[PDB]
Ligand binder design. Structure first.
Ligand SMILES: *[C@@H]1O[C@H](CO)[C@@H](O[C@@H]2O[C@H](CO)[C@@H](O[C@@H]3O[C@H](CO)[C@@H](O)[C@H](O)[C@@H]3O)[C@H](O)[C@H]2NC(C)=O)[C@H](O)[C@H]1NC(C)=O
Ligand SMILES: *[C@@H]1O[C@H](CO)[C@@H](O[C@@H]2O[C@H](CO)[C@@H](O[C@@H]3O[C@H](CO)[C@@H](O)[C@H](O)[C@@H]3O)[C@H](O)[C@H]2NC(C)=O)[C@H](O)[C@H]1NC(C)=O
Ligand SMILES: *[C@@H]1O[C@H](CO)[C@@H](O[C@@H]2O[C@H](CO)[C@@H](O[C@@H]3O[C@H](CO)[C@@H](O)[C@H](O)[C@@H]3O)[C@H](O)[C@H]2NC(C)=O)[C@H](O)[C@H]1NC(C)=O
Ligand SMILES: *[C@@H]1O[C@H](CO)[C@@H](O[C@@H]2O[C@H](CO)[C@@H](O[C@@H]3O[C@H](CO)[C@@H](O)[C@H](O)[C@@H]3O)[C@H](O)[C@H]2NC(C)=O)[C@H](O)[C@H]1NC(C)=O
Ligand SMILES: *[C@@H]1O[C@H](CO)[C@@H](O[C@@H]2O[C@H](CO)[C@@H](O[C@@H]3O[C@H](CO)[C@@H](O)[C@H](O)[C@@H]3O)[C@H](O)[C@H]2NC(C)=O)[C@H](O)[C@H]1NC(C)=O
Ligand SMILES: *[C@@H]1O[C@H](CO)[C@@H](O[C@@H]2O[C@H](CO)[C@@H](O[C@@H]3O[C@H](CO)[C@@H](O)[C@H](O)[C@@H]3O)[C@H](O)[C@H]2NC(C)=O)[C@H](O)[C@H]1NC(C)=O
Ligand SMILES: *[C@@H]1O[C@H](CO)[C@@H](O[C@@H]2O[C@H](CO)[C@@H](O)[C@H](O)[C@H]2NC(C)=O)[C@H](O)[C@H]1NC(C)=O
Ligand SMILES: *[C@@H]1O[C@H](CO)[C@@H](O[C@@H]2O[C@H](CO)[C@@H](O)[C@H](O)[C@H]2NC(C)=O)[C@H](O)[C@H]1NC(C)=O
Ligand SMILES: *[C@@H]1O[C@H](CO)[C@@H](O[C@@H]2O[C@H](CO)[C@@H](O)[C@H](O)[C@H]2NC(C)=O)[C@H](O)[C@H]1NC(C)=O
Ligand SMILES: *[C@@H]1O[C@H](CO)[C@@H](O[C@@H]2O[C@H](CO)[C@@H](O)[C@H](O)[C@H]2NC(C)=O)[C@H](O)[C@H]1NC(C)=O
Ligand SMILES: *[C@@H]1O[C@H](CO)[C@@H](O[C@@H]2O[C@H](CO)[C@@H](O)[C@H](O)[C@H]2NC(C)=O)[C@H](O)[C@H]1NC(C)=O
Ligand SMILES: *[C@@H]1O[C@H](CO)[C@@H](O)[C@H](O)[C@H]1NC(C)=O
Ligand SMILES: *[C@@H]1O[C@H](CO)[C@@H](O)[C@H](O)[C@H]1NC(C)=O
Ligand SMILES: *[C@@H]1O[C@H](CO)[C@@H](O)[C@H](O)[C@H]1NC(C)=O
Ligand SMILES: *[C@@H]1O[C@H](CO)[C@@H](O)[C@H](O)[C@H]1NC(C)=O
Ligand SMILES: *[C@@H]1O[C@H](CO)[C@@H](O)[C@H](O)[C@H]1NC(C)=O
Ligand SMILES: *[C@@H]1O[C@H](CO)[C@@H](O)[C@H](O)[C@H]1NC(C)=O
Ligand SMILES: *[C@@H]1O[C@H](CO)[C@@H](O)[C@H](O)[C@H]1NC(C)=O
Ligand SMILES: *[C@@H]1O[C@H](CO)[C@@H](O)[C@H](O)[C@H]1NC(C)=O
Ligand SMILES: *[C@@H]1O[C@H](CO)[C@@H](O)[C@H](O)[C@H]1NC(C)=O
Ligand SMILES: *[C@@H]1O[C@H](CO)[C@@H](O)[C@H](O)[C@H]1NC(C)=O
Lengths: 169, 341, 341, 169, 341, 169
C-alpha cells in the first residue's frame, strides 16, 4: 500500500516462502534465510472467509410473472412489468458490486498492517540487543541462520543461547 | 546481521478491483459467480408446484378442464407456485368454438394465478326458467358424458326455446348473475352464444337475423354480435361436423359483487362457475417437471444454488436462487503481486 | 516494573454483525429500530388532509356529493393528501340506482385523487332542446331540494319527452359533450338512463322495448342496454317506492377533448360536471382523523418519527416516516467482548 | 482484531475498569493496578455518535396509492403497483443493512488502533527509562502503584520524582 | 534540536461528508456534479433517431402517413430510437374525420414504438366482394392522388353499395380480417365508417337510420354507433365542404392472430395494413433534431457527458448519460482543515 | 483523526509548506524549519484519482418512455411508469451518496497513517543517534537547519557528516 512505499518497507516480496502469506528474512555472510508465519496467514484467511459468509447471507425478493397479467389482453401493463424486473436486477447488481469492491479494498489494504504487527511480535523476542530501524527491520548483535529463524517463526526463540538481555515472561 | 519483514512473491494471474489501488493482479481468488446451464424444469423444493390444472383428467387440456367439458372434471389441487406451459391454450374437443373472437383462451392461465381453485356446486342460474320463455336445454354429440351420448359443457346451459309455442325473436333480455361463492373468493363466470345455418336458425329459435349480447361485471363492459352465414372450418373440436358454432367468454366478478348479461336467441347461460382465492407465483416453464431443484429460472429451468451470484441471461425466477450480476465477480484470497528481488 | 496498554472487560449481551470478524458480542448498542403500534388515523403534520369530499354537507356520503344529490352541495376544499375511507362507496338517498351495473361507485375515489375538485357552473348541454324532440324535465320525490318536493341530481337531467305530441320510439340520437372546464383541468361527465314498468314505459316514453346507450371519450368506449321487467329491490335510495330504476355512469374527458353519448328514450343527459386538476397523495385510512402525526401508515395509522428505521408490517405510508427494515438493527456503542485475565 | 492476536497484545481485557473503554495496567510485587483513559473513550463515543447522525440523515420517497388506480376496475395495474412497492422496500432495506454492517466493521476494527495510540501517549511521558517491548508494554526502572498510575492516566505524570531522564516540554 | 512530522494549513472553503468525522472543511475538492442547461434536441450519437415517420413525404404529418392519405407514402425507415413530437397528432388533409370519437389519433405514436414499420402490399380483404352485396368503391375530392381527382385513404376502401339493384338496409354483416404479415410482426388494421345527410344517406345506401359497428381483436372488443344529423364543423381536412363525416379506428392483431369486424351500411373495409416488429426507445422531444449529443434528456434535450453525475430536473433520458443525484457531490482532494500554530 | 488526538501528534498544521500535503519540522535556536515529502503526497493523489475512476465506471439502465403507453388511452399505467422512474432515480442516488461517503471517509482517515509511515522513513536515516519519543518526534544530538532538512526530505540524508552511528545500506 501507500505505507510500504513511504516507510521504506521492501518493495516486492520473496518467492522463497510457499508456507504462508507473510514472514521474516535473515541477512548476513551466512546467505539469505526466509521463513513464514502461520498465525498471520490464518488470521487473514479468517477475515476473508467470514467476509464471504457476510456476502453470501444477502437475500432478495423473487420477481415472478404477475397473476392478473394475461399476455393477449394487457401487453402494456406487461411491458411495464418487464421494465420493473430489469430495473430491479440492475440496481441490486450495482449494490452487490459495491459491497464486493469495499470488501476487497479492506482485504488488500490490511496487508501492510499485518506486516506492522509481525514487526511487534519480532521485537518481543529480542531484548534491547537490536535497534529499531523503522524499516521494519532490526540489527541483531549475533548471526541468524535458517534453523535459528524457524525458531522465531515458531515463537520458541528466547536467546540466552546467544547470551543477550532477555525480556522476561 | 539484519532481520526484516517481507511478503510473498508468486504467480498472480487473477485480477481484482479496488477503489484505492485500481485494478490489481493477485495470488488467489474465491469466485462468487457461475454461468448456469439450461436444463429441463423441475419441482420446486419446499413447495407445491402446479403444472396441469388437474392431472388425472387424461386427454384433457387445461382449457378443457376450465370450460367444463364432459369427462374432464376432477380435483384441481392447490399450489403456492404454478407453471404456465401454454401461452395460447387449446381445447381437445367438445363443440366447435370460435376461440379467437373473445378472451376465452386465457381462462386457464387466469385460474392458474390463484392458489385455490374450484368448480362450484349447483348453478348460478336456472336456464329453463330464464327470461324469454321456457327453454329446453340443448346437447350435442361431440360432447359425450360419463355414459355416452349428447351432452354439453358443465360450465353453461344451451337455452333452446322449448318447442313451437311462443318461439320467435325477442328484444334483449337482461339477467343478473348471483355471487354464489364464499368469503373472499373471486367468482369467474363462463357464458356465451350459438349461431347456425340461416334455415337452422329459423328451425331452432324463431329468427334468421343476427342476435346481440352484453356482459357487465364491476366496471368491465363487453359487447358481441352474431354471425349467420358460413363460419371458419371447425377446429380443436370433438370431431363431428356441425353447421353451427359457438362463442365463449368469461367475466370475473369481484369479491361480493354481482354481474349482468343481456341476450337474444341462442344464449348459453352460465351454470357451474369458477371459485378462486389465494395467489400462486406463476412462472413460464415447460413440462414435464423432472425431479427437484432449489430454483426455477424462466430461461434455465431447474437450478441448484451453488455460489451466491450468477452471470447470464436474466429472467423471472422462483425459489432459493443465486442473484443475477452484470459481471463475474471475484473476492480476493491472497496478496498483491510482488516482483521478486 | 512493566506498564502496558489494555481495554475493558464487562457484561456483553448485545450482538452485532461485522464483515471481517463475523457476529460478535459487544459492551453496548444504539438501537436504530422500533416496532410501531397500530393507532387511529390523524392529520398529517405539514399538510392538508382530506377525509370527506365536502364536510359540512351532513347526512351526505362522498358518493352523494359526487352525484350531486339535492342538498348535498358545498365547498369541496383542496388537499395535497387524501384518505380513502370507503372502498365500496354508497348513496345515502335520492332515487334508486343499480350501482353495480357500471363503474359509478368509484367516482368519489376518483375525484379524491386530484388536489383540486369543483362542481361546474351552468350545464354541459341543454336537455330540453336535445335531439329527439322537446323534453320536459323529470323530477321525483325521494329527491327533495332546498325547499322540499320533487327534484333530481344536479349532475344530470331526466329527459321525458314533453307530452303526447310526437312521443314515440327513436333510433339512437347522438350527442357531443362540450369541454366546459379550464386550462389543464380534467372534465368528468356524469350521465345515465332510466327504465320502468312495461306499461309505465309506454306511458312515459312512446316505447315498451328496451333502449340502448353508448359513451365514447378519448379512446374509451362503453355500451349499455336497459331492463324492462322487475328490477332488484331498491337500495341506498331516498326511501320512497318507485317502479323504475336508474343506471349511472361517468366518463372522463382528457384535457381539452370532447366526448360523445348516444341514446334512446329515458336518457339522463349530463348537466353540471366535475372539474379537477392537481394531484393528491391518497392513502387507505379510516376516519375519524384524530390529532397530528408525523407519518400516516396504511396499517398503523398515525405515527411519530422516533428512530430512523422500523421493523414490522410494511405498507404505503405518507409524511415524515421511518424507513422499513427486514431485521431490527443495532449500531455498536462499545467494545468487543473480552474475557478477564 | 488480527493485530492484537498477531502482535501479542493481551488476549482478553480487565474487568477492573468501569471508568472507560480503554486503559493502562501496572504489574509488580505491589499487586496489579488498573486505570482508564477518558479521551480515548470520548473519541470513540464521538466516532459512534457522528456515525449515527450519518445513518439518520438518509431520506427516501413516499410510496402511496396511485391516484388513477380504481380498486374495482384496474386490479392488474394495481397488483403491479403492489409489486413495485414491495420490491422498493426490499432493495432499500438491503442497502441500509449494508451501510450499518460497514459502519460496525469500522467501529470494531478501530479498537486495536486506539490501543496503538495509547501506546504512543504512554511512551511520551517516560524518558528512555523504559524499553519498547513491542507487546504494547514498557519496562520501567521504578515501581508504579495505583496513585502513580492515575497520574499517567490524567497525563500529569512527569518523573523527576523518580529521578530519570525527562522528555522536555 | 527536535525534528517532527506535520501536515499543511491553508484556506479550506470546501465542505465534505464523512461517516466518522462528521462534516469537515477541506483544502480542495473534485466536483462529481453538474447542473446541465436546457438545449434543443439532437441526433443520438451511436444510433438511428426517428423524428418524423417518413421524412420526404412533405406537407404530410405522421397521422397522414399512418392513415395512408394519397401522396403521403414513402419509405418509413427504421430506428432503435424515436422521438415523440406530437402528443395529440393531426391530419393535414383528405376527408373530414371526427377524430376524438376513437383512439385513432395515437396511431402514429403507436407505430413509432416499433423499430421496424411498413405499410403492406395488396389488401387484407376484397371490398367489392364483401358481404352485403357487390360494392362500388367510393372516392372523394379532398383526396387527390398522384394524378389528381377523386381518391381515398390507401388504408381503407369506402364500400358504397353498387347501384339501385338490391340497395337497402342490412342486419350486421361479419368479416374476418386475415393475418397478412410475416413471422413475429404485429399487424395493425385500420378501418371505420361514414355518415351523411338524412337524404344523402337514402341516396347512397338504402337507409336513413343509424348504422352500428363492432371490432374484435384478441380480447379487445369495441362498439360504435353512427350520427345522422349535423356534425361538427370540418377540421384538419382537405378543405372541400362535404355534408358527411368519417370515423376511423385501428385494431392491433397479435402475432399470428386473426380479427373481426361487423358492420351495416357505410363501412370502410380495411385495405392496406400496418406491419411492425422490433422496438424503438421513444422519448418526448421536439424537432428539429440539431447536431449530435451523447445523451437525450426529456427536459434538457441534447446533452454531452461531462461529469459522471448531474443535479437538476430528472426525467426519461436515452444514450450515454450522466446519472441523476439528489445533491451536488464532492470527492475530497486535499487535507482536513488545520489551524496554524 | 482519533489517533492524532490520543497519541499527542500535533493538533493543527504548519502553513509554511505549500510544496506538499505532509512533511517534517525542525526545532532549535536556529529557528523553525519546515519541509515537505512528495512521495507521500503523490501516493495520496493516486489513492484519490483511482478512487475517482472507480466511482466513474458505474453504469445504469436507461429509463425511457414505454412503447405501448399511449398518453390519451392509458394514463393510469402511465402514472405508474412515472412512479417507477422516480423511485429508481431516488434509490440509485442514495446508493451513490453512500459510495462517496465511504470513499471520503477512507481518504480522510488515512491521513494519520500517512504521518505514521513518514515517521518510519525518518527513523530510517538517523542511527540510534536519536530516541523515539512516540510523539512522532525524535531528539537528534546535532542541530538541523533548512538545508539540512531538505536533504532528509529528498532522502539523501546520511550522517557521517555529523559523525554519528550510521544505519548501513
Ligand atoms: C349422458 O347422456 C345421456 C344421453 O346421451 C343422458 O340421458 C338423457 O337424460 C335426460 C334426462 O337427464 C333424458 O331426458 C328426459 O326425456 C324423457 C322422455 O324420454 C323425459 O321423461 C324426462 O323428463 C327428460 O326430459 C334423455 O332422454 C336422456 N337421453 C337418452 C337417449 O337416454 C344422460 O343423462 C347423460 N348422463 C349424465 C349423468 O349427464
Ligand atoms: C345447415 O343448413 C343446410 C342447408 O343450408 C342443411 O342441409 C341439409 O343437410 C342434410 C345433410 O347433408 C341433407 O339431408 C340429407 O338429404 C338427403 C336428401 O333430402 C336425404 O336423402 C338424407 O337422408 C338427408 O336428410 C339436407 O337435404 C340438406 N338440406 C338441403 C337444403 O340441402 C343442414 O341440415 C343444416 N345444418 C343444421 C345444423 O341445421
Ligand atoms: C324545489 O322543489 C320544488 C317542488 O318541491 C320545485 O317547484 C316546482 O317547480 C316546477 C318548475 O320548476 C313546477 O312545475 C311547473 O308546473 C306548472 C303548473 O303548476 C307549470 O306552469 C310549469 O310549466 C311547470 O311544469 C312545479 O309545479 C313546482 N312545484 C311546486 C309544488 O311548486 C322547485 O323548482 C325546486 N327548486 C329548485 C330551484 O330546483
Ligand atoms: C308499475 O306498473 C304497475 C302495473 O303493472 C302500476 O300499478 C298500479 O299501481 C297503483 C298503485 O298500487 C294502482 O293504483 C291504485 O289502484 C286502486 C284501484 O284502481 C285505486 O283505488 C287507487 O287510488 C290507486 O290508483 C293501480 O291500480 C295499479 N295498476 C294495476 C294495473 O294494477 C304502477 O302504477 C306502475 N308504476 C309506475 C311508476 O308507473
Ligand atoms: C387518381 O384519380 C383518378 C380520378 O380522379 C383515377 O382515375 C379513375 O380510374 C378508375 C379506374 O382506376 C376509373 O374507373 C373506371 O371507369 C371506367 C368507365 O369510365 C370503367 O371502364 C372501368 O372499369 C372503371 O370502373 C375512373 O373512371 C377514373 N377516373 C377518371 C375520371 O378518369 C386514377 O385511377 C387515380 N390514380 C391512381 C393511380 O390511383
Ligand atoms: C346534404 O343534404 C342537403 C339537403 O338536406 C343537400 O342540399 C342540396 O345542396 C345543393 C348544394 O347547395 C343544392 O343544389 C343546388 O340547388 C340549386 C337549386 O336547386 C341549383 O341551382 C344548383 O345547381 C344546385 O343543384 C340542393 O338544392 C340542396 N338541396 C335542397 C333540398 O336544398 C346536399 O346536397 C346534401 N349533401 C350530400 C353530400 O348529399
Ligand atoms: C495479471 O492477470 C492477467 C491474466 O489474464 C495476465 O495477462 C494475461 O497473460 C496471459 C499469459 O498467457 C495472456 O495469454 C493474456 O492475453 C493476458 N491477458 C490480458 C488480455 O491482459 C497478466 O500477465 C497478469 N499479471 C501478472 C502475471 O502479474
Ligand atoms: C439439486 O440437488 C439435488 C441433490 O440431491 C438433486 O436431487 C437428487 O437427484 C438425484 C438424481 O440425480 C437423486 O438420486 C436424488 O434422490 C435427488 N434428490 C431429490 C430429493 O430429488 C437435484 O437433481 C439437483 N438438481 C440439479 C443438479 O439441477
Ligand atoms: C452474547 O449475546 C447473547 C444474548 O442473547 C447471549 O446468549 C444468551 O444468553 C442468555 C442468558 O440468559 C440466554 O438466556 C439466551 O438463550 C442466549 N441467547 C442465545 C439464543 O444464544 C450470550 O451469552 C452473549 N455472550 C456473552 C455473554 O459474551
Ligand atoms: C406526535 O407528536 C405530538 C407531540 O406534541 C403529538 O401531538 C400532541 O398531542 C397531545 C395530546 O396527546 C396534545 O397535547 C398536543 O397539543 C398535540 N400537538 C399537536 C400540535 O397536535 C401527537 O399526538 C403525537 N402522535 C403520536 C404520539 O402518535
Ligand atoms: C468551511 O466552508 C464554508 C464555505 O461556505 C465557510 O463558511 C462560509 O464562509 C463564507 C465567507 O464569506 C460566508 O460567506 C458563508 O456564509 C459561509 N457559509 C456558511 C453558510 O456557513 C467556512 O468558513 C469554512 N471554514 C473554514 C474557513 O475553515
Ligand atoms: C544453523 O546453525 C545451527 C547452530 O547454531 C546448526 O545446528 C544448524 O545445523 C544450522 N543450520 C544450517 C542448515 O546451516
Ligand atoms: C386418449 O386419446 C387418445 C387419442 O385419441 C386415445 O388413443 C386414448 O385411448 C385416450 N385415452 C383415454 C384414457 O381415453
Ligand atoms: C374447410 O374444409 C374444406 C373441405 O371440406 C376445404 O376445402 C377448405 O379449404 C377448408 N377451409 C379451411 C379454413 O381450411
Ligand atoms: C341526519 O339523518 C338522520 C337519520 O335519518 C336524522 O336523524 C337527522 O335529523 C339528520 N340531520 C340533519 C342535519 O338533517
Ligand atoms: C323485496 O321485497 C319483498 C317484500 O316486499 C321481499 O319479499 C323480497 O324478499 C325482497 N327482495 C329482495 C331482493 O330482498
Ligand atoms: C502510592 O504510593 C504513594 C507514594 O509514592 C503513596 O503516597 C500512596 O498512598 C500509594 N497508594 C496506595 C493506595 O498504596
Ligand atoms: C400544404 O397543403 C396545405 C393545404 O393542405 C397548404 O395550405 C400549403 O400551401 C401546402 N404546402 C405546399 C408546399 O404546397
Ligand atoms: C361552422 O361554420 C359556420 C359558418 O358556416 C359558423 O357559423 C359556425 O360557428 C361554425 N361552427 C363551429 C363548430 O365553429
Ligand atoms: C457534443 O460534443 C460534440 C463535440 O464535437 C459536438 O458536436 C456536439 O455539439 C456537443 N453537444 C453539446 C455541446 O451539447
Ligand atoms: C544550513 O547550514 C549549512 C551548514 O551546515 C550551510 O551550508 C547553509 O548555508 C545553512 N542554510 C541556511 C540558509 O542557513
Amino acid at each position: 500500500g501507500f505505507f510500504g512505499a513511504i516507510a521504506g518497507f521492501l518493495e516486492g516480496g520473496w518467492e522463497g516462502m510457499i508456507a504462508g502469506w507473510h514472514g521474516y528474512t535473515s541477512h548476513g555472510a551466512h546467505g539469505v534465510a526466509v521463513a513464514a508465519d502461520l498465525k498471520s496467514t490464518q488470521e487473514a484467511i479468517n477475515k476473508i472467509t467470514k467476509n464471504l459468509n457476510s456476502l453470501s447471507e444477502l437475500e432478495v425478493k423473487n420477481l415472478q410473472r404477475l397473476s392478473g397479467a394475461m399476455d393477449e389482453l394487457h401487453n402494456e401493463i406487461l411491458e411495464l412489468d418487464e421494465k420493473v424486473d430489469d430495473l430491479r436486477a440492475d440496481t441490486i447488481s450495482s449494490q452487490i458490486e459495491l459491497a464486493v469492491l469495499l470488501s476487497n479494498e479492506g482485504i488488500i489494504n490490511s496487508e501492510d498492517e499485518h506486516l506492522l504487527a509481525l514487526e511487534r511480535k519480532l521485537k518481543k523476542m529480542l531484548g534491547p540487543s537490536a535497534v529499531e530501524i523503522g524499516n521494519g527491520c532490526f540489527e541483531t548483535k549475533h548471526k541468524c541462520n535458517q534453523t535459528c529463524l524457524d525458531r522465531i517463526a515458531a515463537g520458541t526463540f528466547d536467546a540466552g543461547e546467544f547470551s543477550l538481555p532477555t525480556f522476561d515472561s | 546481521d539484519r532481520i526484516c519483514t517481507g511478503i510473498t512473491s508468486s504467480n498472480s494471474p487473477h485480477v481484482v478491483k479496488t477503489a484505492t489501488q485500481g485494478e490489481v493482479n493477485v495470488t488467489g481468488v474465491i469466485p462468487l459467480t457461475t454461468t448456469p446451464t439450461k436444463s429441463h424444469f423441475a419441482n420446486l423444493k419446499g413447495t407445491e408446484t402446479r403444472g396441469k390444472l388437474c392431472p388425472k383428467c387424461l386427454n384433457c387440456t387445461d382449457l378443457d378442464v376450465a370450460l367444463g367439458r364432459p369427462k374432464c372434471t376432477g380435483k384441481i389441487p392447490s399450489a403456492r407456485v404454478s407453471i404456465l406451459h401454454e401461452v395460447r391454450p387449446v381445447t381437445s374437443g367438445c363443440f366447435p368454438i370460435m376461440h379467437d373472437r373473445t378472451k376465452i383462451r386465457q381462462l386457464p392461465n387466469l385460474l392458474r394465478g390463484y392458489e385455490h381453485i374450484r368448480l362450484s356446486t349447483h348453478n348460478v342460474i336456472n336456464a329453463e326458467n330464464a327470461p324469454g320463455g321456457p327453454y329446453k336445454i340443448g346437447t350435442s354429440g361431440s360432447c359425450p358424458n360419463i355414459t355416452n351420448g349428447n351432452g354439453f359443457f358443465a360450465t353453461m346451459a344451451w337455452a333452446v326455446p322449448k318447442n313451437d309455442k311462443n318461439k320467435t325473436a325477442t328484444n334483449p333480455l337482461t339477467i343478473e348473475v348471483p355471487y354464489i361463492c364464499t368469503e373472499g373468493e373471486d367468482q369467474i363466470t363462463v357464458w356465451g352464444f350459438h349461431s347456425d345455418n340461416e334455415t337452422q336458425m329459423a328451425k331452432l329459435y324463431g329468427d334468421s337475423k343476427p342476435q346481440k349480447f352484453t356482459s357487465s361485471a364491476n366496471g368491465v363492459t363487453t359487447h358481441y354480435v352474431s354471425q349467420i352465414g358460413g363460419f371458419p372450418n371447425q377446429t380443436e373440436d370433438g370431431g363431428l361436423p356441425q353447421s353451427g358454432r359457438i362463442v365463449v367468454d368469461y367475466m370475473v366478478q369481484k369479491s361480493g359483487k354481482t354481474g349482468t348479461i343481456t341476450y337474444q336467441r341462442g344464449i348459453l347461460l352460465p351454470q357451474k362457475v369458477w371459485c378462486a382465492s389465494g395467489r400462486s407465483k406463476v412462472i413460464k416453464g415447460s413440462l414435464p417437471l423432472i425431479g427437484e431443484a432449489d430454483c426455477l429460472h424462466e430461461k434455465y429451468g431447474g437450478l441448484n444454488k451453488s455460489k451466491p451470484y450468477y452471470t447470464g441471461e436474466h429472467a423471472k425466477a422462483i425459489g432459493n436462487c443465486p442473484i443475477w450480476v452484470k459481471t463475474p465477480l471475484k473476492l480476493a484470497n491472497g496478496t498483491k503481486y510482488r516482483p521478486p528481488a
